[PDB]
Design a protein around this nucleic acid. Structure first.
Lengths: 55, 55
DNA sequence: TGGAGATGACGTCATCTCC
DNA sequence: TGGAGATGACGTCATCTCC
């Protein structure tokens, strides 16, 4: 009966919502990570720049 | 009547969903941007590294 | 104040994409 | 194949957070 097609999907719907919230969270975390790897890489270049050649 | 509290919220609900999809999209785009700024900054350091001092 | 609007999380339906 | 499961987008309800 209808009942069971609905039951089985309410749950496929619940798992699905949970994956989406773990996707959003990873992105939020990675933007943040790449933003800090960048500050250090842009300092590194500044440092080596004021130095290459020998001064 | 109830009717109108529901009407007004169905719409606050529609705007809200649209903001969320523009949030997800910006993150997707920025992870990507910071990943390419990084490849170039890690090449830059490699280049200047094999050079500082003079060789 | 209390009153409005924004948002989580639900359940549903219609559509896709697979073995 | 067709049959199951994953997903968009809806509408709703209960809760928050503000001026």
């Amino acid at each position: 009966p209808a009942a069971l097609k609905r039951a089985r999907n309410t749950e496929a719907a619940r798992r699905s919502r949970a994956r989406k919230l773990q996707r959003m969270k990873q992105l939020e975390d990675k933007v943040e990570e790449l933003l800090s790897k960048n500050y250090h890489l842009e300092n590194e270049v500044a440092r080596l720049k004021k130095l290459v050649g020998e001064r």
